[PDB]
Design a binder for these strands. Structure first.
Lengths: 328, 114, 122, 112, 110, 111
RNA sequence: GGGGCAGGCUGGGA
RNA sequence: GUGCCCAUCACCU
RNA sequence: UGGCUCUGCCAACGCUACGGCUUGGCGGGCUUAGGUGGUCAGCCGGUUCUGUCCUGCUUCGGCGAAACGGUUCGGCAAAACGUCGAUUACUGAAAAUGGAAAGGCGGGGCCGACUU
């Protein structure tokens, strides 16, 4: 690599890449009407999708916009398998040329960096540097505030390919605020978009002990006043540059726990979020009072992995006291 | 009978393509081959019976055969022992079967629309 | 691009075949492992394994519940073949895990088929 | 009739079976399928002569049409054309004769 | 009754099956199809007797007629002679015996 | 009655080793015997589902066809004859499945 | 007493 | 609905 | 894949239209992704019961205060990578799906220690 990137729709529409996109788009969706209707003539559908992309005639199918309401109401707009496949074809060539420039401390929707690598970086970067305080911010409606215009000043500072730029502008028109949450193209662009505040933490502001997961941003420090100044500088930027309002923020001392990514993260210990605990508790309970106690063991083994890192035992005892079943 | 003669002629291109693939399937995958050949060559009889009658159920059984032929492409692509249909051959065959499915779809609509 | 649309698009048939292709993807390699002898049993097992797809597919493209029970009988016959390849075949054909594993995959296809039969019966 | 149709289809087999036997080893499986369509169509005619319901009379017609496809396949799709277009002309006239009896047979049963 | 025809048709098999095996591999499909029509017509009789539908006895009659076709076809099937006209003559006598029992069976049902 | 299949699985367990032995010589008869032996499960399975005496008479006809195969494979000659012991000690296994099938058919006929 | 953390215990949104 | 990370299941290098 | 409508040999159940066929040997030729979960972006509360801490500085406004993951420890940060420089220079009418760099900032990366 060396900047530019001016021939991407050739790679986006390569059959070897669209097959990867097809595989990625189908991964886990192989029981859905989208895949099963597509899987019928999959390589023929991939041929008319390749020749729709490579020809410049791909039009993104309409988002079917439901509102999932689970943690909080989110207007989650789903896409057709053909459209989720094109997004996967884009975010196979376009994602690793954005995710390459994302400072290493961004842990969202990136290979090898995740929900856990973040909670380990916050907590690790809490142990080293011996942070006394921390700034945790969060962007109001992040996806429904991404400007989709200043974003296409970052997606157009790295794509340079007049055709990929147009495929990205059929997936995500470069108009007004509102990146559809519930799209692969969107997690990247949101991570890319949120990556602007990363560079204002790490490049400007010279903050080296921080972590961003999409819209959540932890900034460990040493003065609860320098971290407050960093936030004010971060908030003023993300507002006047990116149009992202800060919903919640806190410059707390490292003592109040860094509520980062389903783990309240102290330097020493790291519990879980009570919401995740209670959600799993009630989910096991609903599953109980619905009639499933054998798939629960599959879930429990699963959630025992998400909770093996946290110093839990504040659920497994509880659930052993409610039903008697041997968890661990 | 225009659609039956058309659907067979267009399905002949599927056979013309898939039969050489079906003949190349190593004996190891012999049952899969003989069943693929009976599904490939036997889809003609599904089209013939569909044209010989007017029941849209016979044109749906022709669609089931075409769907079964598309399974065979998926299956013979999947088998890794010896080996059969290369992914390019599934691609090209699915294109041919799609034109057979296209004519069958218009055929089904013609019957459903009296 | 609007994916190529077959006529009579039955999800239950598309889902049951995609899930039964996992049974094939598992059983076909160990169907092919059944030695030279036991080849008739393998041919018949393979025509029951690979031929069950056609049973599901014809059941989908049909407004006849009769095709859906024939698909259930074939899945029941495939479950026998697991018992046969394990507990009647001489070398072994199918190890009890491979049996236990396949019986899980066939149960997934059986769960879809039972819901499919129930949805049409109503 | 019921043996009149087979006696004429015997001539189709008597003609096509030597051709089917000429199909090389490479296309042995297609030959086996062609032979089970050629030789097996007698049973389609025979089973229609016994139980005179029109159901197997159309199945016999579908088999004859499938045998006509095999003529197209053996000399059109079988890449080493295992049948010559002349053979696809006299065999089609042999199948057309047994098709004429089958057509009159269909009409006689579906007359009343 | 199914037991009488099968016992009498077992004589057709006992005669034709060695003959059917002697059909050259060259005529292998015709052989394997003749053998599946020889053995396999038992099942037609058995299904006709282990049940009752008259269609099954027509299916048994159709199989017997298909077996008679095979004798006529295998007789002068090609240069690789399958069945001698006497073997056809001898088998046709045994199949006529089972044809007579089938005909009386069909008559007694009707 | 799916004790039928479990009891017939012993007929297969007995009559399958003697079929994986029928040589290539009697290959058609073997392929047909194995399709009659192993395919009888399908007849019982389709009868357990259908609970129709038609699909039970088909299962009875298959057992009768399996009894024919014993009587045919006995008189097949050479070292590859199903030994007369085996024909007897498989008609015993088939009779076990035949008695359960007879009680089956009677249970359905006499509802 | 006020606060911080944690465990609960429940309303909604589910 | 989206991905990241993780757990298990399948499966041979 | 218990093949071969495939041959040579020799047999012998057998069948022969007497040629052979069949059949048996016997040579030979032909024959990493995945599934299912779960996370997390991705709640708002309310309430005390609790367990345990904390309750100071003061400018007088407010700020406060509550046994390891290789999450390791040093050494480096040249290079590569990232990013800004830059879709700039530069070539060329035009950057046109060419295209730098000097540098600047990083730690992602690197080096060892120890452990994995």
């Amino acid at each position: 690599m060396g900047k530019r990137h001016r021939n991407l729709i050739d790679q986006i529409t390569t059959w070897e890449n669209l097959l990867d996109a097809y595989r990625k788009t189908s991964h886990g969706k192989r029981r859905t009407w989208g895949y099963l209707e597509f899987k019928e003539y999959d390589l023929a559908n991939l041929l008319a999708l390749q020749a729709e992309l490579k020809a410049g005639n791909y039009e993104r199918g309409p988002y079917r916009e439901f509102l999932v309401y689970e943690p909080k109401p989110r207007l989650i707009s789903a896409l057709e398998f053909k459209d989720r496949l094109v997004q996967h074809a884009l975010c196979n060539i376009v994602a690793p040329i954005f995710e390459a420039g994302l400072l290493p401390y961004t842990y969202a929707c990136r290979p090898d960096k995740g929900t856990h690598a973040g909670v380990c970086h916050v907590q690790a970067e809490l142990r080293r540097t011996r942070a006394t305080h921390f700034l945790k911010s969060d962007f109001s409606k992040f996806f429904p505030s991404i400007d989709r215009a200043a974003l296409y000043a970052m997606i157009d500072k790295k794509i340079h390919c007049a055709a990929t730029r147009r495929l990205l502008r059929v997936v995500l028109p470069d108009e007004g605020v509102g990146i559809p949450i519930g799209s692969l193209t969107s997690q990247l662009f949101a991570n890319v978009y949120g990556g602007a505040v990363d560079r204002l933490l790490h490049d400007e502001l010279k903050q080296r002990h921080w972590a961003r997961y999409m819209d959540d941003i932890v900034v460990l420090g040493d003065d609860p006043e320098e971290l407050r100044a960093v936030f004010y500088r971060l908030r003023d930027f993300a507002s006047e540059r990116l149009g992202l309002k800060i919903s919640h923020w806190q410059v707390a001392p490292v003592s109040r726990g860094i509520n980062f990514l389903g783990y309240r993260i102290w330097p020493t210990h790291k519990l879980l979020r009570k919401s995740s605990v209670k959600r799993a508790k009630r989910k096991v309970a609903n599953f109980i009072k619905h009639g499933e106690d054998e798939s629960l063991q599959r879930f429990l083994a699963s959630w025992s992995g998400h909770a093996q890192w946290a110093d839990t035992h504040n659920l497994f005892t509880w659930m052993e006291e409610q039903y008697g079943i041997a968890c661990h | 009978c225009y659609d039956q003669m058309l659907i067979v002629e267009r399905y002949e291109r599927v056979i013309s393509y898939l039969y050489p693939i079906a003949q190349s399937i190593p004996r190891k995958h012999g049952v899969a081959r003989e069943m693929f050949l009976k599904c490939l060559l036997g889809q003609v009889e599904l089209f013939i019976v569909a044209g010989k009658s007017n029941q849209v159920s016979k044109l749906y059984a022709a669609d089931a055969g075409l769907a079964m032929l598309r399974f065979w492409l998926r299956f013979l692509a999947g088998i890794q022992k010896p080996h059969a249909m290369t992914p390019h051959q599934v691609e090209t065959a699915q294109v041919l079967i799609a034109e057979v499915g296209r004519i069958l779809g218009s055929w089904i609509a013609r019957v459903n629309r009296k």
